[PDB]
PDB file of C-alpha atoms in Angstrom:
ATOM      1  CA  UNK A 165       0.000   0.000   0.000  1.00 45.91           C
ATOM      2  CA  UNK A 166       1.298   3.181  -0.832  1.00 45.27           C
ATOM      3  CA  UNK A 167      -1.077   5.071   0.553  1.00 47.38           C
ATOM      4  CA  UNK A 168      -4.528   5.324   2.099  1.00 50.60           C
ATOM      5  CA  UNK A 169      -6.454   8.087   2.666  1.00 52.03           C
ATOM      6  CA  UNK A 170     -10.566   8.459   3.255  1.00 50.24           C
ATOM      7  CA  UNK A 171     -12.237  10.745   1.283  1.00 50.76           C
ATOM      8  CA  UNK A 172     -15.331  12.002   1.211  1.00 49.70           C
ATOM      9  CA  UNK A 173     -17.030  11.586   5.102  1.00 45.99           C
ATOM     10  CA  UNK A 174     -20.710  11.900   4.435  1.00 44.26           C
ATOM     11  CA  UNK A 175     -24.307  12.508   5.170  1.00 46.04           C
ATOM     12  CA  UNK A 176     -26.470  13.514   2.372  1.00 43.69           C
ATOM     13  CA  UNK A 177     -28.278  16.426   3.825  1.00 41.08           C
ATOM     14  CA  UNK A 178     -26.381  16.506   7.072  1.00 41.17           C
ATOM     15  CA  UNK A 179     -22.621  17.104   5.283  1.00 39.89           C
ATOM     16  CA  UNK A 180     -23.755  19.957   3.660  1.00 37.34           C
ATOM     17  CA  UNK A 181     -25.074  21.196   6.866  1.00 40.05           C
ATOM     18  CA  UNK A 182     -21.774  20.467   8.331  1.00 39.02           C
ATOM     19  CA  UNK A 183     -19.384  22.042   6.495  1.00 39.56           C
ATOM     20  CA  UNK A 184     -21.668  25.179   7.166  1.00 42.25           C
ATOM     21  CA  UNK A 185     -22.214  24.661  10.465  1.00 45.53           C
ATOM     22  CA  UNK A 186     -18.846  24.309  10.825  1.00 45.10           C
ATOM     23  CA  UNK A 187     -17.847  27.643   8.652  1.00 38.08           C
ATOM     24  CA  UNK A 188     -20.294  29.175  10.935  1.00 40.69           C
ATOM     25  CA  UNK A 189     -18.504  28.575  14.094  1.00 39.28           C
ATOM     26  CA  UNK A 190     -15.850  29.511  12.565  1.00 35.79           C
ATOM     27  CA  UNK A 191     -16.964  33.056  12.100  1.00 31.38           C
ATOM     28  CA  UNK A 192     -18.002  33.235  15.777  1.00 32.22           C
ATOM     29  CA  UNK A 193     -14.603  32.385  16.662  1.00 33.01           C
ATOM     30  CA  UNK A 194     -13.006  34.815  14.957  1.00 31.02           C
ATOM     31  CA  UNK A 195     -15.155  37.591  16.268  1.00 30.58           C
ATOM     32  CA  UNK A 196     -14.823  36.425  19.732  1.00 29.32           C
ATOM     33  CA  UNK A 197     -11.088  36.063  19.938  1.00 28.59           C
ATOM     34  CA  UNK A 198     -10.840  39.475  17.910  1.00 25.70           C
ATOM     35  CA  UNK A 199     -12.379  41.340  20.112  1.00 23.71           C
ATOM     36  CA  UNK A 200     -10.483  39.718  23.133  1.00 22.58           C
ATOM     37  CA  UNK A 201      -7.588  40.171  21.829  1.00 21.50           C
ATOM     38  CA  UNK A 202      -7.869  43.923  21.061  1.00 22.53           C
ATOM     39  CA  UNK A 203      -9.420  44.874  23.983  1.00 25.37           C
ATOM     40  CA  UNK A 204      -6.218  43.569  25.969  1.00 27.36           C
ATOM     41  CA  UNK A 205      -3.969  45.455  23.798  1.00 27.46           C
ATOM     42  CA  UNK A 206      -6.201  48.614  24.125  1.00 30.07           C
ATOM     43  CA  UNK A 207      -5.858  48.057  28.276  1.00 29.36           C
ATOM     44  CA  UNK A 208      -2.011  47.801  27.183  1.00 32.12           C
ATOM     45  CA  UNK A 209      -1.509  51.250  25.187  1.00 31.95           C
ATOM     46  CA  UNK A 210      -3.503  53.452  27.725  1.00 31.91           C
ATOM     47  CA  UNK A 211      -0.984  52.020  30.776  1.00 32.09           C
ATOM     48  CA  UNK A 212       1.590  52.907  28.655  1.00 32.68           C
ATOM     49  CA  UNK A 213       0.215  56.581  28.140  1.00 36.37           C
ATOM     50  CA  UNK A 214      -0.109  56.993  31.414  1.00 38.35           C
ATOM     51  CA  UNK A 215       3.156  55.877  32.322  1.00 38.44           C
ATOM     52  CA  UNK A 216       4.394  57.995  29.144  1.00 38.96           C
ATOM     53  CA  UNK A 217       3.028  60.996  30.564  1.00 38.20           C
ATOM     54  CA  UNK A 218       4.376  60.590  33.908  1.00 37.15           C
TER      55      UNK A 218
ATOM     56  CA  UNK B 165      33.950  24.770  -2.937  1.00 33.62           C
ATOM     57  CA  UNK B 166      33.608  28.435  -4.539  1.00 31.96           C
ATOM     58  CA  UNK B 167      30.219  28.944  -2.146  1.00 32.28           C
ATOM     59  CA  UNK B 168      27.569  27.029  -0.794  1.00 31.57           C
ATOM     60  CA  UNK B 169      24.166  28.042  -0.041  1.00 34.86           C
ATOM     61  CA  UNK B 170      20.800  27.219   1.006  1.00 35.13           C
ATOM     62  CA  UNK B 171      18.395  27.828  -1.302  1.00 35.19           C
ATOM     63  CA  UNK B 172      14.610  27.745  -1.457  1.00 32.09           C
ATOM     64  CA  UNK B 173      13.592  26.344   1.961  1.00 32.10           C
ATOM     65  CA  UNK B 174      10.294  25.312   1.617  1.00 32.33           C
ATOM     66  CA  UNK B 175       7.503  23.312   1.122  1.00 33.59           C
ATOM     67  CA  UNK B 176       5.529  25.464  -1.580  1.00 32.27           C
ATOM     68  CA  UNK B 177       2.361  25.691   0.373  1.00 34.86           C
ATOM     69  CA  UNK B 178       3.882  26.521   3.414  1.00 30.97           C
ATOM     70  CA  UNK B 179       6.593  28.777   2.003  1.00 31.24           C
ATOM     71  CA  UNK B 180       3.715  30.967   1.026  1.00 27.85           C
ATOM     72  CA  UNK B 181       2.349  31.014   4.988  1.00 27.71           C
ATOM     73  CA  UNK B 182       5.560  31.454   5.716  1.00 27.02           C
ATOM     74  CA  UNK B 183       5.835  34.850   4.055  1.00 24.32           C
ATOM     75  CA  UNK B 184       2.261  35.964   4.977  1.00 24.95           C
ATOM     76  CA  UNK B 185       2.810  34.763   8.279  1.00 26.10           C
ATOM     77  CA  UNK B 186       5.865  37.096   8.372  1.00 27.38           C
ATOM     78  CA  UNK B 187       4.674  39.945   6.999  1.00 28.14           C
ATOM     79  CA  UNK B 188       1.682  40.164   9.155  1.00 24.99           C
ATOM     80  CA  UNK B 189       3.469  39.555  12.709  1.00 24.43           C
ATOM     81  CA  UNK B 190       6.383  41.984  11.299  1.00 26.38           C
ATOM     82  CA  UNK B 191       4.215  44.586  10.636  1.00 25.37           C
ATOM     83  CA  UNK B 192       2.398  44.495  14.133  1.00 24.14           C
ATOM     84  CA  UNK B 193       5.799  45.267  15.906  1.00 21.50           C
ATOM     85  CA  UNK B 194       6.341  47.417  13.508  1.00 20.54           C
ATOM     86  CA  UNK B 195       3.099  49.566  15.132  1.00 22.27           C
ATOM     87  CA  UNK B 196       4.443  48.552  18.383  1.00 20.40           C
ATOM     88  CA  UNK B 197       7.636  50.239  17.910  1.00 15.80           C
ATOM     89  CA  UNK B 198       6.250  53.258  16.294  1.00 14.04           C
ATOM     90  CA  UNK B 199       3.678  53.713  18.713  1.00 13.85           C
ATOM     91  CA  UNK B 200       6.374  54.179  21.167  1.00 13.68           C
ATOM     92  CA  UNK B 201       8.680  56.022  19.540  1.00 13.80           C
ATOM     93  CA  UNK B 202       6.099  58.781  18.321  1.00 12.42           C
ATOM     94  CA  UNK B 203       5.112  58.765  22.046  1.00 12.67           C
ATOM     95  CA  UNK B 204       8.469  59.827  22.692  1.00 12.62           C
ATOM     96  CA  UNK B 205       8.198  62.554  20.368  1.00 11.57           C
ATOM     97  CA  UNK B 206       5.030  63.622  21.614  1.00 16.02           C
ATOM     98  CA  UNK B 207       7.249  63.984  24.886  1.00 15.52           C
ATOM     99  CA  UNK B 208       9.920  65.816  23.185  1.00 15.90           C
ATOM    100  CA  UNK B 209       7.389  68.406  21.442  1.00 18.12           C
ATOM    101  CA  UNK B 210       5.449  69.255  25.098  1.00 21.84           C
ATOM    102  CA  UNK B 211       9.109  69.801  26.631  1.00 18.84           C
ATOM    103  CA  UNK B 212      10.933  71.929  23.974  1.00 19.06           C
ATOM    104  CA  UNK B 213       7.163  73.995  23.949  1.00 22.45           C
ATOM    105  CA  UNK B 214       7.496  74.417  27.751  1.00 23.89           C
ATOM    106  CA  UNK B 215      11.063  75.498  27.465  1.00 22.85           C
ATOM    107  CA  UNK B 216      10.518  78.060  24.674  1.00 23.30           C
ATOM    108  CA  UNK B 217       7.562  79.374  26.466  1.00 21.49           C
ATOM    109  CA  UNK B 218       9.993  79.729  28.846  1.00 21.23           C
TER     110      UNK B 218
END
């Protein structure tokens, strides 16, 4: 065997609604971790104003 | 041996993330860096107006 691979995991109705289920969540994640993320750097730049200005 | 060197370290899909991948984290320290540096000058600019005030 050279090589093995599966392709193709399916339900008829239900893979389609995976993949966009799964596109989907993948959105949400995005936004979520975004908005994490800049909100810690945000907290970041006005400490270092502050300490700038003192 | 007149020279040796590496060349094209890859894969091909990967050497492309590679680059993104550089680009994009590059460029954020760039901001970081200029943030702080323009800071500085912000500092600079308050003290020469307070000395020529002066």
């Amino acid at each position: 065997l050279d090589d093995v691979s599966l392709t193709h995991l399916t339900f008829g109705k239900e893979f389609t609604e995976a993949v966009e289920a799964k596109q989907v969540a993948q959105q949400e994640a995005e936004r979520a971790r975004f908005v994490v993320e800049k909100a810690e750097q945000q907290k970041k730049a006005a400490i270092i104003s502050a300490e700038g200005d003192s």
